[PDB]
Each structure stands twice: as C-alpha cells, then as structure tokens.
RNA sequence: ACCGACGCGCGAGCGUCCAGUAAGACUCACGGGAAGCCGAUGUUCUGUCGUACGUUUUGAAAAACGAGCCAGGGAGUGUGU
RNA sequence: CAACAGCUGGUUCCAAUCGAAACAUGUCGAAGCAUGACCUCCGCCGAGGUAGUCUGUGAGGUAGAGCGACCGAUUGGUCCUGUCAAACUCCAAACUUACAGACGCCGUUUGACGCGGGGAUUCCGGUGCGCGGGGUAAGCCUGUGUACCAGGAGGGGAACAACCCAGAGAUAGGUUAAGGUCCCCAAGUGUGGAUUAAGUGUAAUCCUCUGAAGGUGGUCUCGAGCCCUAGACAGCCGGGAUGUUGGCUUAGAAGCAGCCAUCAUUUAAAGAGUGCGUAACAGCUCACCGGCCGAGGUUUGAGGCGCCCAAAAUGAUCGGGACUCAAAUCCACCACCGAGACCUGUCCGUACCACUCAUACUGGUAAUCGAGUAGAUUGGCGCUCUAAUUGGAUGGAAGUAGGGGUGAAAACUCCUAUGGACCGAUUAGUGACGAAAAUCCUGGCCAUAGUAGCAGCGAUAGUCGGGUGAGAACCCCGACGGCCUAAUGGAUAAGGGUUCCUCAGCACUGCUGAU
RNA sequence: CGAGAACCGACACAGGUGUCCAUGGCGGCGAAAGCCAAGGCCUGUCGGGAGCAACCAACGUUAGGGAAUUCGGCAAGUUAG
RNA sequence: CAUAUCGACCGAGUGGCUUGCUACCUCGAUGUCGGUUCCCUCCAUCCUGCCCGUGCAGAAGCGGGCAAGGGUGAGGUUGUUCGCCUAUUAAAGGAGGUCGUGAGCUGGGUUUAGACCGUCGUGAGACAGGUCGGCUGCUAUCUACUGGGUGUGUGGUGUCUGACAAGAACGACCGUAUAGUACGAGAGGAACUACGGUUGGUGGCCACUGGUGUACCGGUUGUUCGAGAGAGCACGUGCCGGGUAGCCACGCCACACGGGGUAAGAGCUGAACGCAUCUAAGCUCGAAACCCACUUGGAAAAGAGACACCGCCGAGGUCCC
C-alpha cells in the first residue's frame, strides 16, 4: 500500500486541526495518511453541517452540471478536500505533498499499528460542559449515500 | 420546463455490440444457480392473444385480449464454459475457465476454427488446448484461500433453425446465482457439459426484464431525438433547430440539452415483462388436433414479417416491447425489480391470432 | 407615507410663514390634554416620553400617536385626573420633489435650481433626549399612563424610552 | 547580560556598580587542492511582481478607438515683417 | 484646390533641472480664444523674508445658546404654564484674519524678498475627510476648506485611481510601518481572564461590509425588587365553614358587570372575598388554613460565547479551506513576521564649496538633494549635392539580414553572412531634407483551407464497345438512351473584328481533364 | 458569330439585345399543353462512392378533425374544358 | 372576546420581477415592441403529501407550518404587453435569465422615403392624432454544448463489476362497494380500505382501426404513334377509384408498492426547577418532499477494474466477398 511516514489516527479529533498539521508536514515532505476518517469530528452541528456540506439535502452534491464544482461524499474525500484547502494544490510542491497524503476509510485503522494523535486536537467528549453536539465523519457522509 | 427527453441513458452514443450486456443480475437465495440467469433467442413479430384473466381480486376472470405479443424464438442454448472471477481491489477479473468438448458444429465463426497461424485480427474463443481440471482446481483453491466472485457461463445461442441466421452465434456470459458459492460452483459445472432451454430458468407468468438495442436510424435532428419543438415559421422551412444551447462563460455547452446525434440503436432493458407463454413447435395436444406434423402454435400464416415461420421452442412476452426488433437478439433475465406477484406456471391462452401480417 | 426622506434632518431652517404659504394644516389635535388649568404638577407618579433619537416627527406622526395615547388615558374616567402635555410643535416645513430644481435625491428636482419641493406637510424634530410628551397624576392604577405611550411609542420613527417617574 | 552589591517604587518592576565586561562581513599570509576548474547565449523549471502598446478619458485590461504580420515610405517647411 | 473647420486621428533619437492648470474677468462665449492666477527660463536688485508657534494691538456674529432683549412664529389657565427661527439677537465660542515683537526656519559664493523681460501649458476635472445648499434618494447636482488621484512607485486591503503604511537613484546588509502570526502564506495552533452556541462571528472605511421599528431554564457574567431560621421556594405538600344567592339592580347578577353595605356566627382559621371562570350557578385560585424539612428563594433588567423580526432569480460562502475552553468576541499581555519607509557599506547623478583656464582633475558638504503627465530649460541628430582640408575600398565599398558596443535621444559604431563597386570624415555652403501606431501608403507573406464554390434553373444525360495517343469519364467512330420544336432549328440587323479554314501545338486560357 | 462561349454587362455572366421563317405531323378553339418529325444537341460542361444518416432546397401522399394555425387562410388546396 | 379571522398608525427589514435615478458605461453602431420556439432558475407553494389552529359537529371551508417530487392547458376581439370575454380544469400562480431568446424564426405595431383625413401654420411643413403601402446581410477562427473517432498515460475472445451520472417516470382526477351508513331534528351527508376507469406525462410497438403508400392494378378526358393492340406526354402520378409492405397515431402495450431517515405536527420517558414539561441527553411515529427501491448511461474512476478461456508463431483481428 502507501508507505506510511507518520500515520495519524483521527477518531474524536477535530478535522481541520488535524488537517492543518498533516498539510504542513505534508508540505515538508512527510508521507502520510490519516485513518479513521469515518470518526473524525467537527463541532457545531446537526443542521448547518448537514447543509453547506455534502448531503443529498446539502445539495452540495447534485448542485450543478457542466460547470461544477463537485464536492465529496465519502468521509475520505470530505476531509481530503479539507486537506487540499490549506495547500497550494494547483502547482509545485502543492500537488506533490498533496498526492503524498491519503486518508483512509476505517473503523479501527486498517493498518496494523495504532497511529498517533496530534498536538491536542482531541474531542475530549466526556461530560462535555465545553462540548456540545458535534458529530461528523461517516454520519454526514451516511445521510449522504456512500 | 419540462426538459425535453430525459437524461438517464447517456450519453446516447451508438451502441457497442448489437448484443445486450446486462449491467446487473438478480440477487438470489434458494437458487441453483441457473448460470443462464439470462437466456435468450430472438424476435419474430407478433400478433395478439386472448387470455383468461389470471387471479386478480377483480371481477375479470374471463377472456380478455392482451397483446400476446412478440413471440421470440428460443431456444435451446448451450453454456460452454463457466468462468470464475476472483479478487480485488480493482474490480472483477477473470480467473480461469472450464471447457467443454462438444463444440456446436457452427461455433467456428466468432469462435474456434480460427487459423492456427496467428492472424492480425485477434482470435476469438477457440480451444483445443484443454485442461478441464486445473481450471477446476484453480477455482477451488482460489475459493478457500483467496476469493472468487460471482461465476457465470459463456453461452451461445444456436441458429438451429431460424429464418436467415448462421453458424455465427453471438453470445455473452450470464451469471449463475446459487446459494453459498461452492454449492453453486458445483451447479455450474454440471450444467457445463450439457445443454439447456428456456424451460429451465423461466416459467409462464414469471416476470423478466428484457434487454436489447433499439432499432433505429442514424443521426437525426432535435425533434425526433428527445422531442423538441419545431418551428416557429421562419426557420420553419429549415430543420427544427432548438434555441441556442447555453450562453455564457463556457463557450461550448455540455448542455444535457437537445443535440443532434445518433438515434435508433440503443441498449436498454425493459422491466417486468410478464412471460405469458412458454412453448414449442412440436405438436402436443390435450385432445386431437391437426396432424401430419403441424407447426408451431403461434406464427402467422404468410410467415411473420421478413423472417417467417416458427416451428420450435418459443416464448411469448406480453405487451411486446421488445426493446429492439425483428430478428435481433434480446436477452432474458429474471425480474430484478419486480412489482406485482407472480402469476401461474401457465396462462389459459384461449386463443392466439394467426393471420397473415398483411391483410 | 412612508416617512423616510422626511424625518432625518439633512436640511436647515424654516418654517418661515413669510416665505412659505399653502402649508397643510396640522392634523394634530390640541396640545393640552386632561384637565388643564389646575396644576397637575402636584402629583405622585411621573413622566415618560423620551425620544432617544434624532428627529423630525411629522404631524402625521404625532396626532395618531398622542390621541391614540389619550384614547387609552380615557380609562381614567374622562375628566378625572392627569393633564397631558405635548411638547414640540410641527413647525418645520418640508418640501418634496417638484421637478424643477436639481436632480437626484429629494430637495433636488430636475434641471438645476428651480422648483424646490412643493410644500407638503410639517414635522417637529427632536434631539437624543427630549421629552416628547409628558404628564401624569397620582398612581391611578399600576400606571395606565405608562401603558399609554406604550401605544404612543410604536408610532414614532424613534425608539422612545418610557423613562421612570 | 545574569548573579551579587546599593538605592528607589503601592506594585509589576526600575536606577547605580559590576560592564560596553568568544564570535563577527571584507581583505591578506602559509599550506593544500580544482582546469568544465573559477568567471554569456538558447530553452525550460522554481520564487517575487505583473490584466499589452498608443490614444480618448475624471477614470482603460477594458464589453471605449486603432492595427493580421513584416519591410520600405510616412508629419514643424519657405519668404516677408 | 494643398477650399475652410474652434471637430476626430496621427506627429519618428537618449539623458539631466524645474514642474502645472482643470480656476477668475471679457468674449455670437461655454468642444474656442484673450487677459489674469499658476509653471519655466533669462537679466537686474540687494537684505531681508515669514509656510509654524507664542504674546501684544485690532477685525468678525457662524456653532451653541436665548428671547420677563427686538422680531415673527407657537400652547393652556386662573400670574402660572407649553414651544421655535437660513433670511431673530440681550449674549457668544472654537476658529479664520490685518499688523507688530519674539522663537523657529530661511536668505546674503545656493542672492532670498522683489523688479523687468522670453516661452508656455491650462480655463471637460475627480475622490476622501470636515462644513455645507438643493433633492425621497443616487456611483445625484452644485459650493467651500484640505489632502490625495489625475501626473505617485513600493507594502497592505482577495481583486480595486484617490482607504491604511509610504512618497522612490543603483546595489547590499539590517530593523521596522500598515497589516498579520491554524493551513493555503512569512511569523503563535501565544499567556491570564470572561462572554457567545447563533457557524452569531472570522466584514476598519465603502455603490461594495445591510439589517429596522424568529426562537433558546445551553452556559457564563453583572444589576435591581421582593421573600427567608418569628423557617422562606418546592419553597414544597394538602385544603379552598354558617346566616347568605347580604341589600339593590338585572333576563340573570349567587365573593368576582354595576351601586350600597361589609356585619354577625362557628372557629385553629376562613374576606359579605384576589384573580380565572359560568348565561347565571358550578369549578379553579388567593386571599385564607394546616403540614413539612432546613437555607437560601423568587421576580426582573443587561451583557459574553454557543445552540435551533429576516423572501429572489446559473453553484452557497468570511479571499478559500476550515474554525467553537476558538482560528469568534471583549479586557489585558508576551514574543515574532512583515516595504523601496528608517538605519548602514560602496557607487551614480544633481547642486554647492575648495583648487583650477576648465563645466578636465583632486578633495569636500547635502538631516535640511534624487517620483512625475502638459509644459519651460539644458548636455548628448539625420538626408542630397557643391567646395577646401583629408581618409577608406576587389586583402571586398554601398545596400541588405542577423547579432555586439555607445549616446537621455535624434542617432553613431563594430562583428558575421550576403553583396560585388563604390564610400566617407572635418569645415563652409546647398535644398524637390526626415516611426509601433494615423479604419496611415505600397509591396510581400502566414493563418484562415486543401475549406466555400465547380449541385439548385421544366434542358437532371449518358452508357457499352472501338479509334488516336506518352497519357483519354468528357477528342473522334458506331450502337443504344435522351434533350430542344417561335427554339438549343434556318436566315439576318446592330455590335464584334479574323473569332472563319488548314496544319503544328498545350507554357496561357477552358469552373476537372484534354490528344 | 449573331449568342446559356464570337454582341453589352470587368468573365466562355442563369441578365440584357431588333427583324423574317406564325402553313411540318397528332392534338385542339388555338401561333395553347403534351408527344413526335426535319434540323440541332448531349457544352445551360467536373467526376467517383455510401439505401445515400442528421440538417437544407424543390416536391408527392398522409387516417380522424377541418382555420382550432396566424396580424391576416400567408402558404397550399378547392373549382376547372 | 386584539391575536379563528381582518388589522390602521408608527417602527425595522429582505428581494432585485416594476418604475425612477446614475447621466456612470456604449454614438469608428451591444439590432426595436409583441409573438414564437428552446433551456435553466426564483418563491415568497396554486394543486398534490404530511401536519397545526378554527368563530373545527359533519360536509364544505378559512388561516398557518414543512415541503420544489410531479403537475399547473384550449379558444373569441386587439399588433398588442396588459386586459376583457367563453367553455373546460385539480388549478388553469406570479417573476428573473441584456424587459432570456432576430450570426433562430416572424414582421402585425413604433419610427425612413409615397399618400389621405382631422387639427395647426401665410407658407415650406408639423403632430408623443388617425390611416393604407412599405427590405430582415455573413461559407464559424475561438469558445460552449450534443454525438462520433484517433492517440497518449495507468495479446485476444466472451462475460461482468460500479465510482459516479440522469429521471417525474410517474402526477392527478372521476366512479362503485363502504353507505343513503357515521354525524344530524331535519335538510343534508363523510372516511379507512378494496376495486373499475379517465386525464396529463413517459417508454416502446403495428396483430387491430386509421393515414400514407408519384410500388402496383383498374377506369377515363385530350393528344401523338394510321386503326386495333400496346404505349408517350398533360411537373414531374393528367384526373378519378382501390391499395401490399414499410413508416406511422387518431391505433395498441407497459410505467408500484414497500422500506429507511426527516420537516410541520402528534406523542413517550425525562431532568434542569423534588411538581409540571414532547427536549435539554434518550425515544415512538409522522409529508406528493429526502435516501433506497426501479429504468438509463457508465473501465479514461490515473487506485485507469474483475473473471473464465484461448494465445505469444500464431489466438484473434483488419481488408475482401
């Protein structure tokens, strides 16, 4: 498969905070993947999350025709896309370290060994006085067809 | 608008192959498999039938005409070669085959009897190179250890007797859906060496999708493509031309909107064709009937269409689409979608209309 | 209506009756309500009516917003209690687009110079904190008069503060 | 600079002394080494900046005007006062 | 006749110093001029000058305010009481302004201030801010003061004439400004604290960033009233007496439309009843009564973050991604990033000083020099032929093409190829003497394109053999098949002018080919 | 030659340009149509191939309805000697 | 009885369909009005689905919420847009796209040159009066889209997979049973569910009916071939009568449900706040709408796929007929 450099878990983990790291590191040269896209969460929700996202109610998909653009539906692409943002994807080391990063669908990570968390981008979803409903990953991409 | 025509089938090219290739297959439980989940021969034109009404809640339980319709001539057809497929990621890919040492004496064209020396044109399926086992073993081993995917069989409809057809047989693989796998794998192996007919997977009353390329002409204008409005009178004299297609930033229009192009041709299935009858050409009667070796039950006198007389195995598929036409080749299926429940093994078929097409 | 390019002061003086004629009469009934004469001033309970804004309410604004006000002041038995006072008068005259002066926005017309807007209406103006129209009596009820002005405000372009006694 | 010493400040902290208490671009010398080895042209990649030119205009990349391209031609001169 | 135009277009080399006006008066004048303002150059003069501030001596009636101070508006009452002003004023700024002294700055080799003279350009402006007048308003019209754009780079603002920083010689190192530090993107996923759950917000200014007079016991913070250990709220739990439906009134009026009365009894306590409710009753509630543990309770105002009044047309958006104990907001704070600005080395230009014949050198000063459209000034032209002085060329002139060097520049010069005979320089003359652009002129050439046309007409015309020939779909022979019938037949006028006939031909012409 | 190449129209131009043959046959009222002689021609001068699609020019036939179309029965049709 | 419903004054907004303004853009030219044809969109929903309220008995309504899947026409006058009128209909909504659409059509109106009338003018002539007639250029370079190929990137035959993409593939109505029932004094008069059918849309097909059918057969007028026979011409069939195949529509066939998750709403358990509470965590249901189901396309999805067999000196393929 792809050669990992530092594979990163992404379970309860804010997506951007993670992909705002691995897309820095990616830039420097580092190779690799986040897994557990699927459980990777962004806060604020169950509404202006479903919409302005990619549901078949978001209407992100099915948005247009021969003009695009199209978005993504799978939890992989959904926050792969986030990764492209925060990268000068178009050219240079941009689409370079870009290609050299993959997000994997996964329940517990498909590759054998648990991968590291990042500098605290953790859910801390327990007795969330500070927390509130934030649920995303698969779920957003589940309302939307896979 | 509504938009004219409907997206769906796209782009709307010509059709590669004049043989239908079913995208999907029924999914099954409590199944053999068939191998020939799909099985088909093809069209003769058709008349109409008087049928007893089946079993509705409704009062009508009497004679009523339905278009006993396009009787297609099938079969028998032979499955030579069950093909395994195994392993992803990527997609399905063939494994190894099986064989058959029977070789219908006509399956040279589009098959065997290729020149031994290599020809610039690619050679079709021909085989004298045989390893029945080895293929069997390869499949079995790549079963326990690796995987396998749904297995299917090659098939080829013979033109034993059809008006104007030849040794050429244009057949495509039809999948077998049995139970687990290995049970079914056995089934497709038994129905390997051997031959089949419609009266196998089939049944009167049972609903089946039907697929085939529509008959039709080459490129035509917008109006009789997806329908479009003709006129107004100005460029009325000229051909119907739709208003400009898209105007803005892209100079070109992807459009999805009214363009001239090929029509005719196709490749589309129909769903839930009922199959009112099953049949033959040999004489069989409950009581005395004509003798002196009469002919098929439903073929009009005067023959039918260009390619006439039917005298062998038939099928009647009411409300004929057929999703193609005269002497082409439709493929049968099982009814994947299904709506209403199945009817019966047979229908009454009180009367069949036999008359010269003309007149 | 609507009053938009009416009550924002972006002009300067006059009223001046010398200068102007054909002023419409005000449709603002008397600015003396309740029993006058006797000094209402001896009262418990106090006042209201603070503008909290800039200016120019038209007589159309005050005259149905003030008797509207009085109407639900009637509760205190016709002639028995409070005096109502209004402060400022609708002096101030406004003119509206008569196509001859300038161009563009109002107080400009067609051409350059020329028709100033023709007289149509008058409105008093007020400051950030002025008392639009006040007076009270002893606490008749909880404060019917306080209820008054609830209605009174809500027909003023400004957001008026009740202001406690 | 610290530290420590003394003196101030409601306090954070400051003043005075300690104290202007290795390294440091260039250049050179000795020794050693390099000869595609040290020092423009064509095309291309990367970085920064960048929507022609001339004219008209308050404002032109302009959906304001001109030119397809190139060569050659193509506009302040004479007398008198 | 090269008509005239106040109107459109065009007007060809480099560099250095200065550097506008888009306003005033007159004008058959408003698409133009002249004269002033303003720009520049030259000569003169000779010691003061005044863009800033302070003080002194004067000028002033706008802001505000007020009107028992004029004036004119504008309430009520039996003197009290309610309001106003561009064309009101008993008052009265800030501030602008004349003059002087003082400090500052500037000037006497850089000669200021000023005087005289030459040359202009210019008299369609625009934007921000402050003050305006008109107008519903405007990316409106029209003033004024000022700074900017025009004619001003560079950094920032997503992009963007005039918003912010900033005014710019070349090159180099360094530090900052505005702005920014999660990624895209340099620098923080900075510190202490609090709010927000709406993705509010991540939007200084503005045609541009809307939002005015939907909801939230999510959570945090702040305030106010009342009630509490004589025990609150729940505060919570439970209960909601007799005369009697009080008298009157009323259709009814029974605690609760209204008027009058508001006693008495039995009580632990209970109003001739606090509110809801009924047609009136009923019923609920308080008011009122009983119980219960023990400490806060309840009502309400405001703010922070989040959560779930407010409608628009191809695909939603803070520049995007995306963000919530924040990457939002407010109050503080620490460290960084980040311009051509500021500092710093060398060089260049310009001005001035010293020396000098010199504007040639050399040394020196510039914190108080270095942006620029129109325009003024100054250093660095080309063409023809004549003459004097004087040079080059077949060991390759001029011209041409491509390329190197110099000059602000017009333009000069060299190298290579080509070309294959003429060509310069200096000085004095002479005159049919002058590029990127003008729907510029002439020529040449690419794309367009192996594209359109060689079909359409009431005349749809050929085909098979053969002849000739280097070559034959269309030149000729035969056969077969057709076309024209007032004409595609016959004879002629005009007009053409050898197109007629023969022989030889195919470079030209023939809508393909051709014998 | 006297003209769908000898004339005028920039051309081997579907245009324009006078006179006599008006007694060739059938037809019929006819110097009309249509067909055919005599006479002239295959030079209204590019060809070859695909059942030869879309689209266009001319045009034929369309069931039932019959101007509902449209500014308007435009266009076509109807009638016919 | 504010708040079933209607709802002034005043105040705050949103949209960008009307109108006005800008005199900002274009006068070396951005083709007019109306119509037509063809595509997309907006709400802020007219109908249909699911809901809440009622001044909700029922029936019929009225008002409000979610919701854009589908549907939402034909004619008479007028150039008209607009609007008036008629009969149907579930209803016959409105608006944006250079007042969408002239390198698409039309050319009836405005607004050239001709002319008449009225009015005004001494007159030429005029009119924000009326009227008749009055022209529509271009071979597509780029871009855009609809379809079709050749290559490049990541041995062949046959059969498949499915990332994604399209759909309205279905919408709606009438009738019968329910039932002359519930509800109601009576008059009147439902529903769930099960059936039959119609209409609009969609796909396909021609046995049947119908159209065409200058294939064909016949009748017949004129004329020419002497007559007869048999024929030519009469636009490309002279005309009339009939009509095979094929192609067609006016003909015929087929086009669900159901499941999952939601909105409005109806509820459950349930605290904060001992009670109460549909909500704060949790949960049961619940729209024609969303997803699936179903039809169509789809190895160029660069992770460029899978399987079986044949084959690398001959498997297959192109040409050929």
Curated annotation (Swiss-Prot), chain A:
The modification N-acetylserine is found at residue 1. N-terminally acetylated by acetyltransferase NatA. It is found in: Cytoplasm. The keyword S-adenosyl-L-methionine does not apply. GO terms for biological process: cytoplasmic translation; maturation of LSU-rRNA; negative regulation of translation. GO terms for cellular component: cytosol; cytosolic large ribosomal subunit; nucleolus; ribosome. Present with 43300 molecules/cell in log phase SD medium. Component of the large ribosomal subunit (LSU). Mature yeast ribosomes consist of a small (40S) and a large (60S) subunit. The 40S small subunit contains 1 molecule of ribosomal RNA (18S rRNA) and 33 different proteins (encoded by 57 genes). The large 60S subunit contains 3 rRNA molecules (25S, 5.8S and 5S rRNA) and 46 different proteins (encoded by 81 genes). Belongs to the universal ribosomal protein uL13 family. Component of the ribosome, a large ribonucleoprotein complex responsible for the synthesis of proteins in the cell. The small ribosomal subunit (SSU) binds messenger RNAs (mRNAs) and translates the encoded message by selecting cognate aminoacyl-transfer RNA (tRNA) molecules. The large subunit (LSU) contains the ribosomal catalytic site termed the peptidyl transferase center (PTC), which catalyzes the formation of peptide bonds, thereby polymerizing the amino acids delivered by tRNAs into a polypeptide chain. This is Large ribosomal subunit protein uL13A. It comes from Saccharomyces cerevisiae (strain ATCC 204508 / S288c). The gene is RPL16A.
UniProtKB/Swiss-Prot annotation, chain B:
Disruption phenotype: A mutant confers resistance to trichodermin, a trichotecene toxin produced by plant-pathogenic fungi. GO terms for molecular function: RNA binding; structural constituent of ribosome. Its main location: cytoplasm. It is found in: Cytoplasm. One of its GO terms (biological process) is ribosomal large subunit assembly. Disulfide bonds: none annotated. The modification Phosphoserine is found at residues 17, 149, 290. The modification Pros-methylhistidine is found at residue 236. Keywords: Cytoplasm, Isopeptide bond, Methylation, Phosphoprotein, Ribonucleoprotein, Ribosomal protein, Ubl conjugation. Methylation at His-236 by HPM1 is required for proper 60S subunit assembly and promotes translational elongation fidelity. Pfam families: Ribosomal_L3 (PF00297). There is a cross-link at residues 32, 129 (Glycyl lysine isopeptide (Lys-Gly) (interchain with G-Cter in ubiquitin)). The modification Phosphothreonine is found at residue 96. GO terms for cellular component: cytoplasm; cytosol; cytosolic large ribosomal subunit. Component of the large ribosomal subunit (LSU). Mature yeast ribosomes consist of a small (40S) and a large (60S) subunit. The 40S small subunit contains 1 molecule of ribosomal RNA (18S rRNA) and 33 different proteins (encoded by 57 genes). The large 60S subunit contains 3 rRNA molecules (25S, 5.8S and 5S rRNA) and 46 different proteins (encoded by 81 genes). uL3 forms together with ES39L one of the contact sites for the signal recognition particle that targets ribosomes to the endoplasmic reticulum membrane. Present with 450 molecules/cell in log phase SD medium. Belongs to the universal ribosomal protein uL3 family. This is Large ribosomal subunit protein uL3. It comes from Saccharomyces cerevisiae (strain ATCC 204508 / S288c) (Baker's yeast). The lineage of its organism: Eukaryota, Fungi, Dikarya, Ascomycota, Saccharomycotina.
Curated annotation (Swiss-Prot), chain C:
There is a cross-link at residues 37, 98 (Glycyl lysine isopeptide (Lys-Gly) (interchain with G-Cter in ubiquitin)). Its main location: cytoplasm. GO terms for biological process: cytoplasmic translation; ribosomal large subunit assembly; translation; translational termination. The keyword Electron transport does not apply. GO terms for molecular function: structural constituent of ribosome. It is found in: Cytoplasm. GO terms for cellular component: cytoplasm; cytosol; cytosolic large ribosomal subunit. Keywords: Cytoplasm, Isopeptide bond, Phosphoprotein, Repeat, Ribonucleoprotein, Ribosomal protein, Ubl conjugation. The modification Phosphoserine is found at residue 140. Component of the ribosome, a large ribonucleoprotein complex responsible for the synthesis of proteins in the cell. The small ribosomal subunit (SSU) binds messenger RNAs (mRNAs) and translates the encoded message by selecting cognate aminoacyl-transfer RNA (tRNA) molecules. The large subunit (LSU) contains the ribosomal catalytic site termed the peptidyl transferase center (PTC), which catalyzes the formation of peptide bonds, thereby polymerizing the amino acids delivered by tRNAs into a polypeptide chain. Component of the large ribosomal subunit (LSU). Mature yeast ribosomes consist of a small (40S) and a large (60S) subunit. The 40S small subunit contains 1 molecule of ribosomal RNA (18S rRNA) and 33 different proteins (encoded by 57 genes). The large 60S subunit contains 3 rRNA molecules (25S, 5.8S and 5S rRNA) and 46 different proteins (encoded by 81 genes). Belongs to the universal ribosomal protein uL16 family. This is Large ribosomal subunit protein uL16. The lineage of its organism: Eukaryota, Fungi, Dikarya, Ascomycota, Saccharomycotina. The gene is RPL10. The chain holds residues 4 to 168 of 221 of the full protein.
